[PDB]
């Protein structure tokens, strides 16, 4: 294939993008799964398993 | 902002030949129009040579002799 | 000239790739988002809605956009297959320029071409004079398949019974004046309801009566004045008053003496369409009495529906009126349902007054290139070319329906050429197998006079781009 | 800067920039251009002017290519974009001589000399059309073609009957004085080309001050003021002072012997229509009714004027000095509707041949409408040109190709420097209608020389090309004939492009 | 984009012509080359100048060989080829420009070398090959103009009663010539002791004149004539003039391969006369002082010979300066208003190629360009080719009257080889380089 | 995979455009120099002397070289013909593949349309079954076309009348040993060239139109095919069908005719009937081919079917090469 117009790498982008945040909180899952750190501009610091903050 | 001498003649003898060459072509009634614009755009065709030189305004002072 | 060629075809060629993904009932969607506002944050798959809020800088382009929303304002469908047809037929005519090829010569060959394709959508159009059973069979498959690749694909069985019952109840006439389109919460898609004499989306006073006789309709120092100008409105002698603004209590309860129905804050389309249906007029200015045309109704009606009160007429001159109410769960989806329906609406009322129709799914784009390419038989040298790029472009429509639905177009739309060249002018691709079959068997078929307009627009829109060569930009002020 | 050959090798470059460009669009396949307005409106034409007009190019030497269509427009306005093709062509074949060593001086002049020679063959090849005769058989066939070469083909042949008949009833054929400031062309949207009106008078977009006024006026009776007939006020706010009841009551006796006394005074000074600048209220209306009188509102600033040349009427300010004199002139007063649209023009109508005509174009586009404003403007200039000199020459090719053959055979007797300028200003003319040709997409060059053999071999007469995608040439047979006036003028005009470009050979500015 | 080839070998082989246009005629400009062992000269000889430019592009090594042509064909006017050839490309470059195809060039050329030789052909003078008067009349003239002028009076008839070898030795001078029936060598009969044989038989390597230490004094005893050191050139006329023939072996020598002569002595040259073999051949015998005079010398009859084959070929005449040049620029232009296509352009253009010829003399003459070629024009379209270029004053003088003529032949043949060479370049596409 | 793929194709298209100029009548010349060696600067317009002297390194073009070069040896005439058919072949094959078409795919669509353009040459050629004067006055046309393009155009009629009657004295197979000095090379060449076409004449009466009449003609089969044919092989049949369509549009380039006009009324011409009209190469319009008497042998259009085809097969379906150490 020669494939000039590349509308498919355009979907990986979406792929990529969508990806990085299911691994960012794949570690929180269960009640035995690891936290996370949220740190705010201002320097307000929490940390906490719930799925939905994060 | 000073020089005299030889090579200062020169600068006014060649500064002169300038406003020559630019109504060089304009002498006689067959010669050549020349264009000069102002800040407003106004183009003027004219083969006179006062209308040339009034709105030339040379800054050099040999020219303005 | 060199350069300015090339900008006005790219530039041209970006819009049209830009929303041929949106072709065909299988179409991709595409994320829409202004810069600097997260609540403008929408997705969607409508062409026209694609190229309308979407901007464009290159002037050569704009007017590719400028004429498909003459197709959306008048038609209201085959949006998209304006701006995709006018593309390819723009991308093979850049080849062509290089094959040594003027554009004023390509211009010859398309007016001789679609001709050749009007006359194949004509020798197609199979009218309907008779069979009114039939005919209501046909207007199914036009109302399904103006809703294809919309909010409403999932419920099409719903709404295309709800379309083509309200062209059946008016039978004449293609104003989609006397067709009412009711907006309102609760219900999901097949929650909609219908009602035959014109039922209204408002309500109206706090004691108003549900049913009277004999009604006329007159559409149009506080406790002193509002009674002034409730004399002059007894004068005429009336039983139905409708005004464009809210009416006050104090002089709505005058009317209570005498028995006329009070009707408060009436749209622009609640003057206009009552004008014709209930026999009344406009009559902005009520100051003169006994002049103006006053209408007539027999009963009028109340049913609640969508947990507000909606007036409902009957006995009104020429009765053949109705309203479609369309049911959702909030706003966003009764926007979606009724673009879908009034575009839906105006199709079917072009097939009322022209009901010839042709076979559609890509069997009557494909026989516009056989009969142009049939047309290359007698033709000039130079226009045997440009005839043969405006056929390719024809053949590609149906090829990106096919990559669109995920289907090989290189061979469902190639295996079509041999099916209609030998007789058989009725194949077709089935999108919902995904194979050729027959659209008379199938039973899907779309408007001619849609198929033709397109066809129109479209070699109309890329005969302004062809006559540019040199671009011209003067300065900004 | 630039002084010497260099001089003009950069000034006819820049003039040939605006000749590349607009020799694409001349003839009826010429290929359009695109507008880029300065407030981002977009339009695509083909004239050669409106291409001139948006041009905003800030070389000097370009914009004196401007100045020539103030002028052209006036005399020629059809052949604005082939005046520009010979002006950059003459320069291209002029920077072939002064690479030989030539004065630029030689060139303009010797373009002058050539320049003769082809004015002298077009009015041997001219053809009469009215000699002797005045006839409107001919004068309006020959407009069918001049609106041949734009998108009004499909009505053209409604319009050049109405364009021929305006020209002819305010301007005379034997004074041969036409005049276009007593033509105005008004224009609204709705309905189609073929819709379009002659209205003997003028035409304003104004309304009466009620619509139970009388409809049509019979009478030559037109009163022209700036205050109407009410309760004096000033141009911005009356602003009656009210205290109570006291003020209010004697305030309105006061205006009731102001709306006896002016509405009677219509009456009495013999006045029907009332054309008056502000508006009426409903109170000066209800007193109208009884006295029969209908009135314009809301007349617009230059609007004023425009009736008082048609009409003869005169603008009074204010109603003490009105008289019989002062009143306008008629023959018929109406208010044409079109549909459902609330423009109400107010129709004035002589009903006899004045010195003073308005058409009125119907459209369901503007730009369409805008479009037939300068195709019969274009028309005005064939039927003036025509009156001035009935004689006329083919046009579409034929002229050039055969003055072209008529420059080059004097070129070979003159002994002088110009012979060369009479050699190039005849390959010059030969490109006008080679521009015709390449914008048909035909062969430019072998549709060209196949026309010489023909106005040489064949028969002395000139015969055109085939632009129109017609059977074949002989342009004659198909109707297609340009004025003897705008020939001669675009060689004219064209070699006064050249003078005044060839004479500049340095630019000077701060 | 084949353009890139036909772009660059019209500009490579303009930039040929656009140099040695300024050496074109008696009074045209010198050169200044620089070779590469270091020294420099002085020439406006053209067929020396491109001899030494050492071109590489295929469109400039093209131009050598075309004034190489002309040197065999006519042998004069060698730089007006190339500066015709320089300047139709470049109004080539204006008809690429309009879209032309160069093959629809190349024919439209063939109408205008087909015309170009019938407008010569009405203009030019018949003359009569066997009068002498009018040989010696028409070399003279144009002889003048070489390098040995002064005695061109001189050389010219001895080229006219020969028609052929020139003999050159130093001592002596120019004025006295002898035409010799036989041949005669530039070698001497050392180190025989005869030096004078009559009755004698010759056989290249019974015989008793040998054209090739003991063999030096045995050849002497039997009283035979040893003639040696004798390059390959003379091999080639001694078999034509009097019948002989190699002999590279002793045993090969016999009767068959030996001639005859009446007399063969050394008058130092070696006078051969009294051929007696069926043939054609005549020397002539040239003295001079210094080398360098008789060099020339040689020049001045090798010249000439030219002159006598151009009238031999073409009977005619024509006017000089440029003269039948502006009746050629004139003529085709009317011919171009009568044809259609993309002939009539082409024709044209063709003519105004050749206005350049006597503008670049004008130039070289110190007049102007354009006044020169600007009023010929009307002199000729009244008159004829009489008026023209005189360059030794310097003005329009009466060519005929000045006593300068060409012959037919020069001309036509500049203009066949020039035109046939351009659209050998119009026939190129493009080129490629291979091993 | 990719960078191998383009190797092929646009390896091969330069051998294309090489002489894509030397085609027709009024072809082009050629200059060619080689290294080292100055004095060998020349200049021809043949294609079969031009490739055979130009060194190649790509090895995908080598199979090219070959392949045509049985048309030198066998057919000796028309070897231009065919890497001209190859190269556009490839050309439009490589936007087929662009389209995600497989190159195996389009092989297949080309045997199918290789059967329908021969069915189109025996429909159009004419055989000779008696009227021997019509056949002598034929075989001019066939050697009246050989010596197209050549410097042989001053007695071009002429050599016609010198190689067909040589063969009709011979009587018997093919084989031609039985029967300045530029001008003696260029003469004595071509004469082989034209003996070794008119040897299959006398065998194989058989002759088809020719001045572009034949190209087109197999064109309108096959575009007749691809409404007979499954669909992706359909598109195949279309690239197939547009190389023929381009063999006479480049003879009118370079003939400066205007290509656009003359080549494309012929296919309006031949759709509808009228299997007779053929580009004049001399006054540059339309005409009956069978009246003006212009003609070429069927076995070498055949040939150059088959051979230009099968040469495309091979380089069409290979996208991988692999070089190995030199030596």
Not at chain 3, 417 to 444: K, P, Q, V, Y
Not at chain 5, 134 to 161: D, E, F, H
Request: glycine letters at 8%; aromatic letters at 2%; hydrophobic letters at 40%.
């Amino acid at each position: 294939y020669q494939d000039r117009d590349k509308p498919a790498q355009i979907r990986f982008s979406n792929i990529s993008a969508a990806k990085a945040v299911a691994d960012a909180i794949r570690t929180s899952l269960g009640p035995k799964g690891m936290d996370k750190m949220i740190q705010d501009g201002k320097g307000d610091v929490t940390i906490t398993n719930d799925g939905a903050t994060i | 902002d000073s020089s005299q001498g030889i090579p200062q003649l020169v600068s006014n003898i060649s500064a002169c030949q300038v406003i020559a060459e630019a109504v060089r072509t304009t002498l006689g009634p067959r010669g050549m129009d020349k264009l000069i614009v102002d800040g407003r755009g106004k183009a003027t065709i004219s083969n006179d040579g006062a209308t040339i030189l009034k709105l030339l305004d040379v800054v050099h002072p040999a020219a303005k002799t | 000239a060199e350069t300015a060629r090339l900008t006005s075809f790219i530039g041209a060629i970006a819009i049209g790739d830009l929303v041929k993904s949106t072709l065909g009932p299988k179409g991709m969607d595409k994320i829409l988002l202004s810069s600097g506002r997260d609540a403008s944050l929408m997705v969607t798959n409508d062409g026209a809605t694609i190229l309308k809020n979407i901007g464009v800088d290159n002037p050569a382009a704009k007017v590719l956009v400028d004429m498909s929303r003459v197709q959306d304002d008048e038609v209201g469908d085959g949006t998209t297959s304006v701006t995709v047809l006018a593309a390819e037929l723009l991308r093979e005519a850049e080849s062509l320029i290089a094959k040594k090829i003027h554009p004023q010569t390509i211009i010859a060959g398309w007016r001789e071409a679609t001709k050749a394709a009007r006359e194949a959508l004509l020798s197609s159009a199979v009218d309907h004079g008779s069979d009114e059973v039939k005919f209501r069979q046909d207007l199914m498959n036009i109302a399904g398949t103006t809703l294809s690749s919309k909010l409403l694909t999932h419920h099409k069985d719903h709404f295309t019974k709800l379309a083509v019952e309200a062209v059946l109840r008016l039978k004449g006439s293609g104003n989609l004046e006397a067709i009412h389109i009711i907006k309102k919460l609760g219900g999901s898609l097949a929650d909609s309801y219908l009602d035959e004499g014109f039922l209204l989306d408002k309500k109206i006073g706090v004691n108003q009566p549900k049913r009277i006789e004999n009604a006329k309709i007159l559409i149009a120092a506080e406790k002193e004045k509002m009674k002034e100008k409730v004399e002059r409105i007894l004068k005429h002698g009336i039983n139905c008053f409708i005004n464009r603004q809210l009416i006050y209590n104090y002089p709505e309860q005058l009317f209570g003496a005498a028995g006329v129905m009070a009707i408060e804050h009436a749209d622009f389309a609640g003057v206009e369409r009552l004008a014709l249906v209930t026999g009344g007029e406009i009559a902005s200015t009520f100051d003169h009495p006994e002049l103006v045309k006053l209408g007539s109704c027999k009963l009028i009606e109340e049913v609640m529906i969508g947990e507000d009160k909606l007036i409902h007429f009957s006995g009104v001159a020429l009765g053949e009126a109705c309203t479609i109410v369309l049911r959702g769960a909030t706003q966003q989806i009764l926007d979606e349902a009724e673009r879908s329906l009034h575009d839906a609406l105006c199709v079917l009322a072009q097939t009322v007054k022209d009901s010839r129709t042709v076979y559609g799914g890509g069997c009557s784009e494909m026989l516009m290139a056989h009969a142009v390419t049939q047309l290359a038989n007698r033709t000039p040298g130079k226009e045997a070319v440009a005839m043969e790029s405006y056929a390719k472009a024809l053949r590609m429509l149906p090829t990106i329906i096919a990559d669109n639905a995920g289907y090989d177009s290189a061979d469902l739309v190639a295996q079509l050429r041999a099916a209609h060249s030998e007789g058989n002018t009725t194949a077709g691709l089935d999108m919902r197998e995904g194979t050729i079959g027959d659209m008379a068997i199938l039973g899907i078929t779309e408007s001619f006079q849609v198929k033709r307009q397109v066809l129109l627009s479209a070699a109309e829109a890329a005969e302004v781009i062809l006559r540019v060569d040199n671009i011209i930009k003067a300065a900004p002020r | 800067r630039l002084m010497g050959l260099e001089a003009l090798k950069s000034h006819i470059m820049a003039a040939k920039a605006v000749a590349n460009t607009m020799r694409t669009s001349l003839g009826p396949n010429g290929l359009d251009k695109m507008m880029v307005d300065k407030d981002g409106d977009v339009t695509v034409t083909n004239d050669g002017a409106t291409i001139l007009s948006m041009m905003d190019v800030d070389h000097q030497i370009a914009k004196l290519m401007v100045e020539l269509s103030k002028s052209q427009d006036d005399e020629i306005g059809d052949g604005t974009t082939g005046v520009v093709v010979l002006a950059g062509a003459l320069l291209e074949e002029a920077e072939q001589l002064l690479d030989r060593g030539i004065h630029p001086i030689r060139i303009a002049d010797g373009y002058e000399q050539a320049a003769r020679v082809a004015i002298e063959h077009l009015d041997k090849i001219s053809d009469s059309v009215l000699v002797d005769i005045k006839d409107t058989e001919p004068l309006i066939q020959t407009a069918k073609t001049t609106l041949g070469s734009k998108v009004v083909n499909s009505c053209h042949r409604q319009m050049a009957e109405i364009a021929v008949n305006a020209v002819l009833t305010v301007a005379d054929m034997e004074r041969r004085d036409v005049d276009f400031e007593l033509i105005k062309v008004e224009g609204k949207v709705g309905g189609r080309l073929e819709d379009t009106k002659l209205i003997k008078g003028v035409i304003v977009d104004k309304d009466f001050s009620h619509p139970q006024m009388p409809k049509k006026v019979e009478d030559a009776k037109i009163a022209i003021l700036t205050c109407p007939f009410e309760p004096p006020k000033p141009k911005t706010k009356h602003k009656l002072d009210v205290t109570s009841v006291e003020d209010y009551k004697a305030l309105q006796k006061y205006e009731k012997e102001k709306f006896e006394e002016m509405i009677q005074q219509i009456k009495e000074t013999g006045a029907n229509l009332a054309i008056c600048q502000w508006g009426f209220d409903d109170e000066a209306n209800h007193l109208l009714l009884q006295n029969n009188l209908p009135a314009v509102r809301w007349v617009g600033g230059p609007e004023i004027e425009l009736i008082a040349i048609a009409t003869g009427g005169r603008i009074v300010p204010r109603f003490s000095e009105l008289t019989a004199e002062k009143l306008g002139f008629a023959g018929l007063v109406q208010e044409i509707s079109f549909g459902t649209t609330k423009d109400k023009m107010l129709v004035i109508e002589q009903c006899k041949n004045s010195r003073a005509v308005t058409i009125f174009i119907r459209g369901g586009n503007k730009m369409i409408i805008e479009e037939a404003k300068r195709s019969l403007h274009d028309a005005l200039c064939v039927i003036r040109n025509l009156i001035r000199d009935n004689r006329v020459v083919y046009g579409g090719g034929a002229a050039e190709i055969s003055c072209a053959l008529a420059v080059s055979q004097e070129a070979d007797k003159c002994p002088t420097l110009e012979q060369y300028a009479m050699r190039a200003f005849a390959d010059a003319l030969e490109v006008i209608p080679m521009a015709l040709s390449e914008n048909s997409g035909m062969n430019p060059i072998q549709t060209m020389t196949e026309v010489r053999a023909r106005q040489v071999k064949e028969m002395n007469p000139a015969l055109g090309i085939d632009c129109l995608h017609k059977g074949t040439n002989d342009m004659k047979q198909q109707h297609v004939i340009e004025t003897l006036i705008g020939k001669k003028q675009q060689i004219s005009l064209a070699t006064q492009m050249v003078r005044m470009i060839l004479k500049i050979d340095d630019i000077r500015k701060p | 984009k084949p353009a890139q080839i036909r772009f660059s070998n019209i500009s490579a082989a303009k930039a040929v012509a656009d140099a040695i246009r300024t050496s074109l005629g008696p009074k045209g400009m010198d050169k200044m080359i620089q070779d590469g062992k270091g020294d420099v000269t002085i020439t406006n000889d053209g067929a020396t100048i491109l001899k030494q430019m050492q071109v590489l592009h295929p469109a400039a090594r093209m131009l050598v060989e075309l004034s190489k042509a002309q040197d065999i064909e006519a042998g004069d006017g060698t730089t007006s080829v190339v500066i015709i050839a320089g300047s139709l490309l470049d109004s080539c470059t204006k008809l690429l420009q309009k879209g032309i195809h160069p093959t629809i060039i190349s024919e439209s050329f063939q109408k205008a070398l087909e015309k170009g030789i019938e407008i010569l052909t009405d203009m030019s003078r018949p003359v009569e090959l066997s009068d002498r008067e009018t040989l010696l009349n028409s070399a003279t003239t144009s002889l003048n103009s070489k390098v040995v002028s002064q005695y061109s009076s001189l050389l010219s008839p001895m080229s006219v009663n020969a028609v052929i070898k020139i003999v050159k030795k130093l001592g002596g001078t120019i004025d006295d010539c002898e035409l010799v029936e036989g041949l005669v060598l530039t070698q001497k009969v050392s180190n025989s002791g005869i030096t004078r044989v009559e009755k004698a038989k010759i056989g290249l390597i019974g015989c008793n004149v040998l054209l090739i230490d003991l063999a030096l004094h045995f050849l002497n005893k039997m009283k035979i004539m040893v003639i040696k050191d004798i390059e390959r050139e003379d091999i080639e006329f001694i078999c034509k003039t009097i019948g002989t023939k190699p002999v590279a072996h002793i045993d090969q020598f016999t009767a068959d391969m030996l001639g005859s002569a009446e007399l063969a002595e050394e008058v130092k040259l070696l006078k051969i006369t009294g051929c007696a073999s069926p043939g054609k051949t005549v020397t002539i015998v040239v003295r001079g002082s210094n080398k360098l005079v008789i060099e020339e010398a040689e020049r001045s009859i090798h010249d000439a010979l030219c002159v006598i084959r151009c009238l031999v070929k073409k009977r005619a005449l024509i006017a000089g300066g440029g003269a039948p040049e502006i009746e050629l620029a004139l003529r085709l232009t009317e011919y171009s208003r009568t044809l259609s296509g993309m002939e009539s352009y082409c024709v044209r253009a063709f003519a105004d190629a050749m206005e350049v010829i006597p503008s670049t003399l004008a130039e070289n003459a110190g007049l102007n360009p354009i006044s020169t070629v600007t009023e010929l024009r009307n002199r000729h379209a009244q008159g004829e080719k009489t008026a023209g270029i005189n360059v030794r004053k310097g003005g329009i003088s009466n060519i005929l009257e000045e006593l300068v003529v060409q012959p037919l032949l020069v001309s036509v043949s500049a203009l066949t080889l020039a035109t046939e060479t351009v659209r050998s370049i119009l026939k190129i596409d493009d080129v490629v380089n291979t091993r």
